[PDB]
Design a binder for these strands. Structure first.
Lengths: 395, 154
RNA sequence: UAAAUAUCGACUCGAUUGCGAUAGCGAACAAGUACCGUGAGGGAAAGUUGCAAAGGACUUUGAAGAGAGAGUUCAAGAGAACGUGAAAUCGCUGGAGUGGAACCGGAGACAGUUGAU
RNA sequence: ACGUUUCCGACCCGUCUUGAAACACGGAUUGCGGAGUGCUUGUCUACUGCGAGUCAAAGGGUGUUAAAACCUUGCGGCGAA
RNA sequence: GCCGUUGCGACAAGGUCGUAACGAGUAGGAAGGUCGUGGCGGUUGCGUUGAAGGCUGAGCGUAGGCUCGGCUGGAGCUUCCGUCAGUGCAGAUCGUAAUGGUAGUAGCAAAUAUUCAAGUUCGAUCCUUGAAGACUGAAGUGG
RNA sequence: GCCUCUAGUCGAUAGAAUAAUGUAGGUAAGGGAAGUCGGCAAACUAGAUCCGUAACUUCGGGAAAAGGAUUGGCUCCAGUG
RNA sequence: ACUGGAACCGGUACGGACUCAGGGAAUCCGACUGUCUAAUUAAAACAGAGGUGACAGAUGGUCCUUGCGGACGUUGACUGUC
RNA sequence: UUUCUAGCGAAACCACAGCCAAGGGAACGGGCUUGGCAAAAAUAGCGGGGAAAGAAGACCCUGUUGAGCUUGACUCUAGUUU
RNA sequence: AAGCGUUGGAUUGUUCACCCACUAAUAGGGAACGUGAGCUGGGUUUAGACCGUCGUGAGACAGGUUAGUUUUACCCUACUG
RNA sequence: AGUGAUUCUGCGACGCUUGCCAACGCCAGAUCACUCUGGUUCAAUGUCGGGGCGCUAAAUCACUUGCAUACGACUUGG
């Protein structure tokens, strides 16, 4: 018997199974199509979701009701310290797909890059790449490495550099670095291999990968919520108050026939910590490291002249202080604070106006995100509140 | 009263110990004892004390219906184990008796290895439980016989 | 108003093509007992060491149960819940199989068993 | 041969039912117990003895390996109209 | 080719043999059973140098079942001839006794609440002492 | 009702953790029964003093109808033997 | 011991916890208080006061008991039962 | 509470067992036929199926089976009148 | 051409029906008349009680009315992790 | 040296062999008639001993972390 009144099904069946992500790091399931004519460039980067804030900007959208008006928008800060290129790998097409042909590592790998190969680095003898390093200063090893480079130049249709994050400069607990394969776009295969070889053991900055007012994609694992019932996992209607045996359930989980529960029915299980790829996040600013002179005031704008860094009053809650380069994305980003976000260039050929709109920041909020912040800087707070008993006793 | 399921390869350099109608759970004790198969005596005693301290887990290989999971189960290549303390105590008492028997027979106690170990169900003890609507159901205890044979390994 | 006649309820006896401990009386035994119901009343289960207790002295670990030695005995693997000790069910050792049943009939092979004046 | 492995065949028994592997009922497993009997009266059939007869009853006489066996009937049963 | 049934036949035999044709079967009817069980009147034997009972290799029979070997067990058992029967179990939501998977599972969640030091003990959340913190709250968790 | 004194108890198997579903409590922006067979459940009201109180009526009631104001602490004033 | 009153004070608030009806306009049924299907129906059902009728003046009426005998009845129409 | 741990520890149910589509079948298969398929051991949930479990259908019919009650059924009877 | 939608409500237990309103549209159906170890229990559908008609009566009435216990998953599979 | 759909090819260099004629010339060869030998058939691996070069790691438990979590698991550090 047909259901009396129609209603769309609850949830998107193309995002199932709602299971925990296989990996903590976001996997890049597709890279932007390679165009041989453009200059050689990287297609992805790694950052950490520091926190959120809000900004004021002037909108240039002809025909809009907010044209030449100021609007307040929420933004997310992603700290993106420079990465280190530690290896080169290439892929050869086969009847069953692309296949990795060879990998050449840099002569000197950082301790934090090598940690990634370990679960007990401190307890171990740290023998990783010890014999490989000697091959770079050997007659036969040099020949083998050169042959690998020749193979990459001659047979591969796609080139990727293994890059790794740097963790010591962040002054935090973790030291193990994150490795990731990033495809190189632009130029021929030979040029890509030469470029990767030159950049082996070298640092790449985020401003060389992403531009301003550019739409990018964020790949990563969402915020986890553990085991959850149907009412929260799938957002089904709650049952009446008079329901015996519970109302936060799905009343009917199938008809008599087929005499089985279908995979399309809502069931309780893991909610959150799902792999996701959100596209079309606009870059509002690429700020420089606050430890350098250029980034000394990466929290100010052309119209807000106060000297301040991006980090809000009292630090980013549950994250720390953003002292490296950062990207200010518009809106929400998947995952909690401290989560590792993989930034990828857009696979789409952007044509909407929002993609090419120029962002003009007028002001960036740096008030405390714990409590209801009333001041933008400690100097402003002290100037407003005057002098306290602590200062009196300090005198 | 209960004969040994096995006999030592050679009774000269070996000792035995037995216990009958012990009021421990047969299933827990059986798993704990089967965990001791082949261990040297000192290793077995250390393992049982670690089990009592929650430093090592007894893997439940046969009677594992509803048993929980734990991190220590990895060392036994299984996903289900527990820490049966009463079973550990009873097995420690049995191993102490076997050690005393070895000393009595004059054997190097520092070279004893568990050649054989077995746990068998014993006659059940009966009690009562009261259910709804004025009914009565059994409330039984499943005790076990335990037997161990230690041998001198060269 | 005796005898011939009825009758094992009571007392005392002799038998048997009957049953052999789920049988035969409900009861082979502290059985009309334990136990149940306010009451009238209802009403079980329960035989077996060994020829003889000779019923395991003594040593040893343990708080003890108990165990390891030892002793008694035709024999204790007859050790007190003790003659024998089945099936179901269950544990160990070794061998072999193991993709949403397992079993089974027919026909070989292997392993194995067995016979060859 | 109640081991393994191959090729072919192979639906769970009992039951009521026109029709059961049935989405019909009983059956979780094992041991032990468990159901056409006794007697009276008929009838037919088979066998045995005697035969216009046959069987004899209650009873009596005797019997001490005495509840048996053995002997015993103007009369009674059935048969001879 | 072999087994049996039926018909016929040979042979000094409740037996053997020959020969030709034949062989489905529920309900049901007959026949055979040196198939099996327990008594009785007789007959034949075995047994503490190991009976009944029990576990299980070599065989026999179309089958019912039977014989022997090995191990356990400790006192009875048995052939054949008549005759007799409380004479054969898979079922009956069968009677009775025992035992499984479920399963180390459901569960041991009302009535506010325990903690520290010590004693005794082989052994203490639970017994005892002291200190603290709470409760019943006089229509009490009192007498 | 709530707290305490005398007297008596800490007896309700314990420990860790605080997923889903639950049982029992506590809240919720704006709307306010649109939910549902149905305002089921919950929420609202309430003590005391002063004031005020309808239809109808068996003249007794209705009635705490409806509906308003006040309420703490401290320092005083007055009355009541 | 209780009652009335006046200044001042604070604070989100004064029956500061606690205890304790939401209110109103109508229709149907039963007048009311009360009783009942212990363990699915608490009601509009039963009872009820009030009304009517019947029988009975005792040698009587209504009942019980096998019978003997007994109850209303320590009663007598303003009574008794139905 | 559930959850994990220590100690303790049941019951219902059970022919054998448990992946499906169609077919035909006692006319809605876990088993059969043809196809789809098919890889240990497990923890927490779940209520689609097992025409799931509880109970020899309280509905309906049959039975030469009843019982409670009624009366103008048949046959009687206490009592009472004569 | 079933990819995707096909609503909020008043009355009624109602499926239907009818009306109010919005809307791109207010399409029709199946899955044991899908879905009760998912709920609810309004109706139907025991026992209490009332009315009308019927019956001498006990009682009857797809005629109306009011109140009337909604049990179990810890097993296998499926599904979710 | 070439080959990319990882092995396979060409070129060398060095070893071990490999053809015909005199010529069945000469020596050996036979298991009695066939029954699993090609009259020692070939491959795949496991393990135990000797040698030749050759190397001198990690997981896990327990602590710790909180981006994770019913328990496992996940993310960190010594």
């Amino acid at each position: 018997s047909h259901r009396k009144f129609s209603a769309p099904r609850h949830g998107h069946m193309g995002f199932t199974p709602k299971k925990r992500s296989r990996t903590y790091r976001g996997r890049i399931k597709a890279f932007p199509k390679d165009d041989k004519s453009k200059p050689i460039h990287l297609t992805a980067f790694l950052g950490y979701k520091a926190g959120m804030t809000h900004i004021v900007r002037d909108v240039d959208k002809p025909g809009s009701k907010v044209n030449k008006k100021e609007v307040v928008e929420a933004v997310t800060i992603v700290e993106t310290p420079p990465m280190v290129i530690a290896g080169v790998t290439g892929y050869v097409d086969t009847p069953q797909g692309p296949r990795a042909l060879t990998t050449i590592w840099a002569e000197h790998l950082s301790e934090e890059a090598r940690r990634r190969f370990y679960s007990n680095w401190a307890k171990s003898k740290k023998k990783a790449f010890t014999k490989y390093a000697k091959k770079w200063q050997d007659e036969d090893g040099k020949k083998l490495i050169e042959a690998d480079f020749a193979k990459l130049k001659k047979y591969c249709s796609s080139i990727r550099v293994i890059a790794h994050t740097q963790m010591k400069i962040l002054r935090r607990r973790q030291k193990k670095a994150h490795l990731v394969e990033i495809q190189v776009n632009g130029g021929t295969i030979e040029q890509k291999v030469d470029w990767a070889r030159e950049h082996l053991e070298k640092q790449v900055q985020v401003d060389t990968v992403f531009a301003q007012d550019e739409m990018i994609d964020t790949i990563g694992v969402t915020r986890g919520h553990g085991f959850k019932g149907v009412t929260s996992r799938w957002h089904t209607k709650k049952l009446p108050r008079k329901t015996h045996k519970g109302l936060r359930k799905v009343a009917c989980i199938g008809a008599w026939h087929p005499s089985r529960v279908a995979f399309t029915v809502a069931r309780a299980g893991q909610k959150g910590f799902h792999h996701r790829t959100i596209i079309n996040n606009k870059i509002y600013r690429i700020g420089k490291s606050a430890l350098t002179e250029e980034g000394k005031n990466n929290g100010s704008t052309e119209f807000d002249l106060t000297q301040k860094t991006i980090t809000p009053m009292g630090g980013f809650p549950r994250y720390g202080i953003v002292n490296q380069d950062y990207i200010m994305l518009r809106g929400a980003v998947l995952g909690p604070k401290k989560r590792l976000i993989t930034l990828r260039k857009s696979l789409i050929t952007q044509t909407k106006r929002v993609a090419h709109e120029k962002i003009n920041l007028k002001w960036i909020d740096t008030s405390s995100k714990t409590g209801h912040g009333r001041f933008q800087t400690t100097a402003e707070k002290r100037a407003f509140m005057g002098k306290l008993k602590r200062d009196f006793l300090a005198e | 009263k209960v004969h040994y399921s096995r006999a030592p390869e050679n009774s000269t350099k070996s000792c035995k110990a037995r216990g009958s109608d012990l009021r421990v759970h047969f299933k827990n004790t059986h798993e704990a004892a089967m965990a001791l198969r082949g261990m040297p005596l000192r290793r077995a005693q250390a393992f049982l004390n670690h089990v009592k301290e929650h430093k090592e887990i007894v893997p439940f290989r046969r009677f594992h219906g509803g048993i929980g999971r734990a991190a220590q189960t990895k060392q036994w290549n299984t996903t289900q184990g527990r820490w049966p303390v009463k079973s550990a105590d009873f097995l420690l008492d049995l191993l102490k008796n076997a050690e005393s028997n070895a000393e009595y027979k004059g054997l190097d106690v520092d070279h004893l290895v568990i050649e054989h170990i077995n746990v068998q169900r014993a006659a059940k003890l009966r009690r009562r439980t009261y259910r709804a609507h004025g009914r009565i159901n059994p409330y039984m205890s499943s005790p076990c016989h335990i037997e161990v044979i230690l041998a001198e390994k060269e």
